[PDB]
Every structure is written in structure tokens, then in C-alpha cells.
Design an enzyme around this catalytic site. Structure first.
Site: not given
Ligand SMILES: Nc1nc2c(ncn2[C@@H]2O[C@H](COP(=O)(O)OP(=O)(O)OP(O)(O)=S)[C@@H](O)[C@H]2O)c(=O)[nH]1
Ligand SMILES: [Mg+2]
Length: 307
Positions: A11, A16, A161
Site C-alpha cells: 500500500e 501508482t 515495480d
Molecule cells: N490519496 C493518496 N492515495 C494514494 C497515494 N499513493 C497510493 N495511493 C492509493 O493507495 C493504494 C495503494 O497504492 P499502490 O500503488 O497500489 O501501492 P503498492 O506499493 O503498489 O501496493 P503493493 O502492490 O506493494 S501491495 C492505491 O489504491 C492508491 O490509489 C497517494 O499518494 N495519495
Molecule cells: Mg504494487
């Protein structure tokens, strides 16, 4: 020629970021591609409102209107249709549900829960298509390694990623070969949350243990370390409601965006053991804000250019 590796906990926002590199350098998401994510948007909204009413039972909270119990029942059976929209909207408007939402720290709730639910009327329409913001707001666990290529100023990047959850960190090592730079993503809003894998582990603390491992890693003594302190828009909203002392007993500063964020950055920079030999380039980011990420990319570019 340039290898970029996105590391961080789950998360964190790494996926993103990838989505934003396609938006900025690949001219966004086509209308057809958006319709692909339409099911993801609906799944996320459903899972979120389900997660809330389920929390009520655990948290001893009841609806402001007893008639909602039939809607909550209806939500589970249906798990989009105009009836399901009316059910979710009534559940979201309920005083009891809203009380439980403002205690989401006590259970596991998607970051983008309120974003989708507060915009349900738009989401519920027919011929609705996810906006670029909607797509970025989607959550899908990353399993395995995903690469992406984009070219900037005659320099083209290999962006890697990978999943942040513990289940996937075993596979991080497979990418460590030939990394130009690491973008370590950290959710600023994670300071009072807990891991979904481990109910009693603090999310930010987990992110710290990770950063210590990566920042002071034997394989990466060459690679420049970039620290993305992400979700600053959520941190701004959140810091007023929850004290940062939940994450740090010692923190005697104010619960303010500027001062609190400054503190978190410092705690992460302090993990650098080779603090004289190696530098850490830190940037505050809102990964869902394309304009903000554009600025971040330029900051990433300058760090790589320093080589
Ligand atoms: N408001 C806001 N939401 C965010 C931000 N960054 C990510 N998110 C939200 O949080 C969620 C997780 O982001 P994501 O890019 O999927 O994390 P991740 O590191 O890829 O998660 P994983 O694949 O390791 S489990 C997404 O649904 C996204 O919409 C941010 O900077 N601001
Ligand atoms: Mg991811």
C-alpha cells in the site's frame, strides 16, 4: 540503460507511480483502457463498505437508523446495479457507518474508500467510465515483478515495480542486479495504521525496518537512494485527527502537516548508517496527483543525472 527499482512496503504507492509514468510520458489512459478498470473500481468500493459494516460488529457500533440492517443484509447478498447503488449510498450516509469510518484505524480499510463512496452517484451511472484519477485510486496487490519502459531526454528508464507485502519480499533480490537508482516509497498516512499481514505491527515501523535494510544494503552501496514520502495529501488530512505519538512515543512536536512530516523524514534519514559516505534524496509526493508526480519525476531525473 537506466534501471529504476521501486521498493517499499505494501500500500506504499509504488504501483501508482508506475501508472503515473504512463500518464505523463505515454499520454494517459485510453477510454477503452479505463473501461478495463471499471470492475476494479466497483470491487474496491464494495470491499470498502463491506469492511466498514463488518467493523461495526467488532467495534460495538450500531446504525443511526435501525432500518439500515436490511440494507447491510442486501449489500452482502448482492456482492453494478442501481439497487446496489441505493443500498451503498444509504449505508454511507448513515450516522453509525460514518462513526465507524472515523475509527478506521482500528481495522483495515482501503485508502481510497471515501474517495469512491463520496462520489458514488457518478460511479453508479450507466455508461460510466473510470477517470484517470479513478484508475490511479484503484488498489490491486502486485504479485511478481512488473517492468515498464519510458524515454526522457534521450535517456530511457527500466522501471521495476514489485510487491511490498512480506509475501513478495523474497522476490526483491531478483531485481537487485544493475540498479541505477531506488525509489523507496513510504506512506506518510501509515503512522497510526497496522499491517494487514500482522495485526499488531505498526505499518510505519515496518516501513522503517525495510528502509534500514535497503538503505544500508551491501548490494546497493553504489546505488543512489531516493526516499518518496508518499500520501502527503492523506497525511495532511489525517494528522489533525490522529496524533503522531501513536507511531513515536518521543514526539513532542505539534500534530501539523509541515512539522510532523519534517519529523518522519528525519527518522528515515537517520537510518542511514553510512551517513557521511552515502546521501539520501527525499521528496514529498502525492502519487495520485499527476502534476505532483511530474515534479517528483524531475527530482528523480536530477538525482540520476548527478551520477
Ligand atoms: N490519496 C493518496 N492515495 C494514494 C497515494 N499513493 C497510493 N495511493 C492509493 O493507495 C493504494 C495503494 O497504492 P499502490 O500503488 O497500489 O501501492 P503498492 O506499493 O503498489 O501496493 P503493493 O502492490 O506493494 S501491495 C492505491 O489504491 C492508491 O490509489 C497517494 O499518494 N495519495
Ligand atoms: Mg504494487
Amino acid at each position: 540503460e537506466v534501471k529504476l527499482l521501486l521498493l517499499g512496503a505494501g500500500e506504499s504507492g509504488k504501483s501508482t507511480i508506475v501508472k503515473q509514468m504512463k500518464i505523463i510520458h505515454e499520454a494517459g489512459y485510453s477510454e477503452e483502457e479505463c473501461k478495463q478498470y471499471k470492475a476494479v473500481v466497483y470491487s474496491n468500493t464494495i470491499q470498502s463498505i463491506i469492511a466498514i459494516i463488518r467493523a461495526m460488529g467488532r467495534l460495538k457500533i450500531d446504525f443511526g437508523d435501525a432500518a439500515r440492517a436490511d440494507d447491510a443484509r442486501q449489500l452482502f447478498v448482492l456482492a453494478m446495479t442501481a439497487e446496489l447503488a441505493g443500498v451503498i449510498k444509504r449505508l454511507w450516509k448513515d450516522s453509525g457507518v460514518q462513526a465507524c469510518f472515523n475509527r478506521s484505524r482500528e481495522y483495515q480499510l482501503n485508502d481510497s474508500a471515501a474517495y469512491y463512496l463520496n462520489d458514488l452517484d457518478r460511479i453508479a451511472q450507466p455508461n460510466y467510465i473510470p477517470t484517470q484519477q479513478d484508475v490511479l485510486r484503484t488498489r490491486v496487490k502486485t504479485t511478481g515483478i512488473v517492468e515498464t519502459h519510458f524515454t526522457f531526454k534521450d535517456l530511457h528508464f527500466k522501471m521495476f515495480d514489485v510487491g511490498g507485502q512480506r509475501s513478495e519480499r523474497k522476490k526483491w533480490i531478483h531485481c537487485f542486479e544493475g540498479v541505477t537508482a531506488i525509489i523507496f516509497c513510504v506512506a506518510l498516512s501509515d503512522y497510526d495504521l497496522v499491517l494487514a499481514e500482522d495485526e499488531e505491527m505498526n505499518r510505519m515501523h515496518e516501513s522503517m525496518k525495510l528502509f534500514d535494510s535497503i538503505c544500508n544494503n551491501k548490494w546497493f552501496t553504489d546505488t543512489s537512494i531516493i526516499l518518496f514520502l508518499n500520501k502527503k495529501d492523506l497525511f495532511e488530512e489525517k494528522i489533525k485527527k490522529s496524533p503522531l505519538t501513536i507511531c513515536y512515543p518521543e514526539y513532542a512536536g505539534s500534530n501539523t502537516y509541515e512539522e510532523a512530516a519534517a519529523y518522519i523524514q528525519c527518522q528515515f534519514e537517520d537510518l542511514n548508517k553510512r551517513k557521511d559516505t552515502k546521501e539520501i534524496y527525499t521528496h514529498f509526493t502525492c502519487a495520485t496527483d499527476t502534476k505532483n508526480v511530474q515534479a517528483a519525476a524531475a527530482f528523480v531525473f536530477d538525482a540520476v543525472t548527478d551520477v
